[PDB]
Design a protein around this ligand. Structure first.
Ligand SMILES: [Mg+2]
Ligand SMILES: [Mg+2]
Ligand SMILES: [Mg+2]
Lengths: 108, 196, 141, 173, 127, 199, 190
RNA sequence: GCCAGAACGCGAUGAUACCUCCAGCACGUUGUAGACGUAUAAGAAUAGGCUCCGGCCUCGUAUCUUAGCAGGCGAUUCCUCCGUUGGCCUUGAAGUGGCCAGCGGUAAUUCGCGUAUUGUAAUUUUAACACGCGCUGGAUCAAAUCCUUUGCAGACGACUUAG
RNA sequence: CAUCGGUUUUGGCGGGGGGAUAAAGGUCCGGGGAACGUAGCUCCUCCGGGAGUGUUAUAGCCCCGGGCGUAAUGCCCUCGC
């Protein structure tokens, strides 16, 4: 029997919306990627697909797990945090939640 | 400080057992009925384990006291239960002192001496809802005052725009918990002597 | 004895001291400019350990146990290179534990997907032998 | 900013009364040539009555250090305006180039005497040929017999993104 | 997560791959080139006929009878594979597996699956 | 990165540790700080004491039972006041971020057997310049009304005594494992194969 | 200005053992052993040449260099203490009321206790407990004189100052009431 | 020392009827400030430390674990690793870990058989808690309140009593 | 997903021009100097140094000129991918 995991994605945390102190723009989200600590490393993940996986209370299409899809657009700041844009603005209660960063379309 | 464990001796009198009910007259008096099996079963190994715990771990030991209100001319039958701290030697000594005292009456003679200075703790005499002059001893107002004499005139300045906690207000007086200290004993009389 | 005291004798900053600059290069100290800056010259044939002559802040360098003996102050390139070769600094650095640790990091970063799998397989086989040895030691203890 | 050294030659515009006027050379430490020409007219106005409107810039080119790899001692004379008067001072620096010494002074004079670029005039910058020309204590201690010192304390360099460390770092690097 | 061998790039980002069915159970299959990682390990194709690489890279080969066989009216049973495709995979595997087995760990390396452990940073990992 | 981070509070500066911890809590990281009686504050202890006395004099005038500031005196609560001032605690997001933090005096179980992490950005041995003065939050708490300086002190001696005994067992295992590796009969070919792989 | 090197040296007699674990200085001599802690000053110790201990500070700002000479004298005082000891003489000064003094070594603690009665008309009793390791005697050679002896200068000097500070006059012109116990010469035992 | 006691702070103890409680198993959730290896215990100094006493110390860029239908069925082969049940000992800071018995499963090495068709990407629906339903094996047969009464108390509640 | 169009962001590559046609720098050939004075030598200690003489010797350094050399690098400005 196998004694290993099955993870094919990098782990990330939804930090916050794009904002300027007293104004926030839910259209864009800030995502922290575990292990990414500078802009030269955040360039690898540009364009990769990001998925926020949460649970609903009703069973639709034979499941309770729901997904919101997105992608990494550009680096943010100097510390490797990146801006991500999703199909719908990502929920505000999920600040600090965990997102999956797939290795989808790959240039390597 | 945290209470680690409690050990109860068997054969508790009804005076103790009434303290654990509000309707003792119609109850089944099941208090400590399943507990006495600890003293009996396995030669009281359950009680022995608890005593070993107190000696090894605890740093403060107290006994659970019990009054004999049936010996007083009071209509009450509930006894007042209490914790008394065993000040003295080592923790091992305190446990053997308390354990030997189980179910054994303790007289006031041993605890206190004739010329000892003690502190007396009780709840004072209740007076009900009383006014400002009785609660705080403020000066009474002149007899010309329109809306009452036994009052405080100014209950605060304009600012702070609140009535403060330091201003005398009517309310409850008496029935407060107090600890009166520095009381000298003059005599410890005997209940059997005819010349007390 | 008479006096028994410990020792915290650091590595001195001196003309001839070999520094390790950022990136992995080496450079001796040819003249001290300030208490925070030195003039260095890394005349090493190997491009990895070669450093151009210039001033570097001491806060960005790491002092090494290797010292170029009796190097004259302010010696130019060539004169430093002659002393660098005479002292055999390049050879001594190779056996240094810092180089071995640095080389080990480079080898691990260069591993590919196949190599990482092979590293797994060869580590598991090696671990099995050590597990047998340790169990025998404990049982026979 | 980071300063270059320019030589700027100026001249009054020739007129009928003065067909051939005099040439005025000057060495200026400036971040760029635009400022260097601005500094030239500022110094020439007070000195030789010449104004930019009635003058022309003959040339403005960079003087580069001849030996940027030799450690040399510099002595600088300046005048500056404090908050209550004007004072002349003399300082000494140990750098590689005359420009490097001048950048040091502007930071040194701002740190210690709170002076700014707009308050300092660089009168003269010279290279001390020997060691008995040094007249300051902070510079004499760097040219001793065999300078060799350790680096006590010297906290290590740890990545600011590595928030947590498993073991306590040792300050013996 | 599986590891497969690239046969031919067809068009519009579509790749024809097969991780030998007797190694990791990946049949002849089309995969878009954006959803793969191209490693530095190359398997020599000396022995695989390019003639049979064609006529299966030619389209409609995979979805020829999808519409014909879509029965879902009901003890479920596996959709039996067309005997033509079973023979086609068997023919290709003969040369491919023989070349693969000549490398000490390549046979086991292909049989395994790829996963990310703790501390593995894909932006830093070489392939 | 991790699941739960246990931070050894000894030797860290109160403010610099609090800011780092505050940001991690908002990002969604659960943090446990132990040995908060050993936290440091820069400057002479007299200034630290005077700063707390000015804090003690601020209290609601008309009713001290309501409205705070409710001056807490334990070292774990002095630190928690520093962190709470760095959180938007009046919102549901800031309220949840504070629920991720547990602060203790000493090292209570089960944290007595978990790895203790340090924050180099806040270590006073790295930050403060030599020759400058500093104090300890434990000493400041003691002289403002804390009651368990000695109870915690005795419990830590027991923990170190228990921890000390665990160390020889660890040393023996390390000594035995070194012997096993040297005495292991391993294939020669795989020896350099792993060596050229960096392992 | 920061100084790249400040240095002090201290001669160690051949009959004295000096130990410095980290910065805690232990001096062992004929008269006993003394321990001093100096972990509050950043200093480096070294052996220079056959019985001399070097003290150096590497980057000081004239406030650390000042502490360099202080440490040298403190360490030199430890060496003197275990070889020749310290002896303080104190004389009694009064105008009308003789000062009655009794000294006795406490059995439970071990420290000498100086008890002063009959200050200027005073009925109160001034009890002063000496620092550990200090011996108190009443001199027989000269009348009205105390003698304090010990290896530690801090212990001896602080003990002598405690006696002097407790004998202070109150609410009187101190230029007229020059009464108290005042420290005489501060030589050594040997 | 003394007064109050958080009515959303906590501990010990006694008895707990029922639509009950304890343990195990099984299934499910209109549950989750948000699992995916969610692995890692000396103490202490930092102008000094660790040690297997041989030596070592910027560096956690480390160590363990890491292959197999989300991981099958057999074979060859090695006594490693993991989980669980029972017994003994031990841990009180908000009680947790250690030796031994049995049972169960296991690539250090080498193979054979099965995967396909989810059709070119669509979360990888699987963990841990909490709760509910049910079954099995045991355990138990209680109080409080209203009411009448008391006056050490009381505006009314409340409180001290007694039935 | 592939191939395009518009806008934009971030990297990399090749080639030109300019300044003292960079200044430096390496090697060689010349001239002139000194010390934080290398060898040798003269003194006290001589475990370890200090003092003097001594201008390259059994290290070297500074200044000026000239070949290799139309050297390289660097900065700025540019033509493209
Ligand atoms: Mg009226
Ligand atoms: Mg385009
Ligand atoms: Mg050029």
């Amino acid at each position: 029997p196998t004694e290993a995991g099955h993870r094919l994605y990098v782990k990330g945390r939804h930090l916050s919306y794009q904002r300027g102190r007293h104004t926030t723009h839910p259209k864009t989200s800030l995502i922290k990627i575990e292990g990414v600590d500078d802009t030269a490393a955040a360039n690898f993940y540009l364009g990769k697909r990001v998925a926020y996986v949460y649970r609903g209370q009703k069973e639709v299409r034979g499941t309770k797990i729901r997904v919101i899809w997105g992608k990494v657009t550009r680096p943010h700041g100097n510390s490797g945090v990146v801006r991500a844009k999703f199909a719908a603005p990502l929920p505000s209660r999920s600040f600090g939640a965990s997102v999956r960063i797939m290795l989808y379309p790959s240039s390597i | 400080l945290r209470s680690l464990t409690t050990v109860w001796a068997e054969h508790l009198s009804d005076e103790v057992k009434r303290r654990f009910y509000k309707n003792w007259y119609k109850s089944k008096k099941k208090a400590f009925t399943k507990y006495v099996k600890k003293h009996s079963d396995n030669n009281g190994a359950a009680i022995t384990r608890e005593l070993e715990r107190i000696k090894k771990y605890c740093t403060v030991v107290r006994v659970l006291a019990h009054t004999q209100i049936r010996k007083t001319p009071l209509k009450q039958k509930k006894a007042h239960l209490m914790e008394i701290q065993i000040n003295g030697g080592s923790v091992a000594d305190k446990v053997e002192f308390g354990h030997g005292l189980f179910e054994k009456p303790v007289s006031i003679d041993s605890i206190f001496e004739k010329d000892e200075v003690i502190d007396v703790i009780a709840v004072t005499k209740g007076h009900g809802f009383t006014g400002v002059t009785a609660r705080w001893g403020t000066k009474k107002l002149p007899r010309k005052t329109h809306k009452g004499l036994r009052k405080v005139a100014c209950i605060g300045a304009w600012h702070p725009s609140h009535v403060q906690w330091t201003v005398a207000r009517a309310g409850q007086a008496g029935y407060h918990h107090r600890t009166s200290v520095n009381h000298k004993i003059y005599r410890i009389g005997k209940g059997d002597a005819e010349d007390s | 004895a008479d006096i028994q005291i410990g020792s915290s004798a650091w590595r001195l900053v001196e003309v001839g001291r070999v520094l390790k600059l950022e990136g992995g290069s080496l450079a001796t100290i040819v003249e001290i400019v300030d208490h925070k800056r030195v003039l260095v010259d890394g005349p090493s044939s190997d491009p990895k350990l070669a450093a151009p002559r210039g001033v570097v802040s001491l806060s960005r360098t790491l002092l090494t146990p290797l010292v170029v003996e009796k190097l004259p102050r302010g010696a130019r390139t060539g004169a430093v290179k002659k002393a660098w070769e005479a002292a055999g600094i390049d050879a001594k650095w190779k056996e240094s534990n810092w180089a071995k640790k640095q080389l080990q990091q480079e080898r691990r970063k260069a591993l590919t997907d196949f190599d990482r799998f092979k590293v797994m397989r060869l580590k598991k086989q090696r671990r099995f032998e050590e597990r047998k040895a340790l169990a025998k030691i404990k049982a026979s203890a | 900013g980071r300063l270059q050294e320019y030589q700027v030659i100026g001249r009054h515009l020739p007129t009928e009364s003065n067909p051939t006027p005099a040439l005025y050379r000057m060495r200026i430490f400036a971040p760029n040539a635009v400022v260097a020409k601005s500094r030239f007219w500022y110094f020439l106005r007070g000195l030789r009555k010449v104004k930019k409107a009635t003058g022309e810039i003959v040339t403005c080119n960079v003087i580069t250090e001849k030996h940027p790899l030799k450690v040399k001692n510099f002595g600088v004379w300046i005048r500056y305006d404090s908050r209550s008067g004007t004072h002349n001072m003399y300082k000494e620096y140990r750098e590689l180039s005359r420009t490097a010494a001048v950048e040091a002074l502007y930071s040194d004079m701002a740190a210690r005497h709170r002076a700014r670029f707009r308050s300092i005039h660089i009168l003269k910058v010279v290279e001390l040929e020997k060691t008995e020309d040094i007249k300051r204590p902070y510079l004499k201690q760097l040219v001793t017999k065999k300078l060799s010192f350790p680096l006590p304390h010297r906290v290590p360099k740890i990545s600011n993104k590595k928030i947590f460390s498993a073991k306590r770092p040792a300050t013996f690097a | 997560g599986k590891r497969v061998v690239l046969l031919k790039a067809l068009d519009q980002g579509v790749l024809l791959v097969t991780g030998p069915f007797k190694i990791n159970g990946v049949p002849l299959r089309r995969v878009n080139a954006r959803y793969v990682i191209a490693t530095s390990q190359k398997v020599d194709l000396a022995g695989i006929d390019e003639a049979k690489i064609n006529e299966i890279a030619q389209p409609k080969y995979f979805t020829a009878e999808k519409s014909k066989e879509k029965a879902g009216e009901e003890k479920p049973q596996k959709k039996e594979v067309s005997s033509s495709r079973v023979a086609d995979q068997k023919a290709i595997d003969k040369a491919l597996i023989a070349n693969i087995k000549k490398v000490e760990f390549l046979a086991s390396y292909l049989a395994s699956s790829f996963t990310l452990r703790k501390g593995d940073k894909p932006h830093e990992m070489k392939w | 990165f991790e699941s739960v981070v246990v931070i050894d509070g000894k030797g860290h500066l109160l403010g610099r540790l609090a800011s780092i911890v505050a940001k991690q809590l908002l990002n969604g990281q659960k943090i446990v700080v132990v040995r908060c009686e050993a936290l440091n504050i820069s400057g002479e202890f007299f200034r630290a004491k005077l700063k707390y006395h000015s804090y003690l004099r601020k209290m609601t005038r008309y009713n001290p039972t309501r409205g705070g500031p409710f001056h807490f005196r334990a070292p774990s609560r002095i630190f928690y006041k520093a962190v709470r001032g760095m959180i938007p605690h009046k919102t549901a997001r800031g309220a949840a971020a504070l629920e991720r933090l547990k602060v203790f005096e000493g090292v209570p179980p089960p944290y007595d057997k978990k790895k203790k992490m340090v924050v180099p950005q806040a270590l006073r041995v790295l930050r403060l310049q030599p020759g400058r003065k500093f104090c300890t939050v434990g000493r400041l708490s003691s002289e403002v009304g804390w009651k368990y300086e000695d109870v915690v002190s005795r419990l830590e001696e027991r923990r170190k005594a228990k921890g000390a005994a665990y160390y020889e067992r660890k040393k023996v295992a390390a000594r035995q494992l070194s012997e096993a590796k040297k005495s292991a009969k391993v294939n020669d070919k795989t020896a350099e194969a792993l060596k050229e792989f960096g392992y | 200005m920061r100084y790249i090197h400040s240095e002090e040296t201290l001669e160690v007699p051949e009959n004295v053992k000096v130990s410095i674990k980290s910065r805690i200085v232990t001096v062992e001599g004929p008269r006993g052993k003394l321990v001093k802690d100096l972990s509050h000053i950043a200093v480096n110790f070294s052996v220079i040449k056959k019985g001399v201990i070097g003290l150096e500070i590497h980057h000081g700002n004239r406030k650390n260099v000042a502490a360099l000479r202080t440490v040298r004298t403190i360490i030199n005082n430890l060496i003197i203490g275990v070889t020749k000891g310290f002896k303080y003489k104190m004389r009694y000064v009064y105008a009308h009321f003789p000062i009655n003094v009794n000294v006795e070594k406490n059995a439970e603690t071990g420290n000498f206790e100086v008890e002063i009665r009959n200050f200027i008309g005073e009925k109160i009793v001034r009890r002063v407990v000496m620092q550990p390791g200090v011996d108190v005697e009443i001199s027989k050679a000269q009348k009205d004189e105390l003698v304090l002896s010990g290896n530690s200068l801090e212990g001896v000097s602080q003990s002598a100052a405690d006696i002097q500070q407790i004998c202070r006059v109150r609410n009187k012109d101190i230029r007229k009431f020059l009464d108290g116990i005042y420290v005489s010469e501060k030589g050594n035992i040997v």
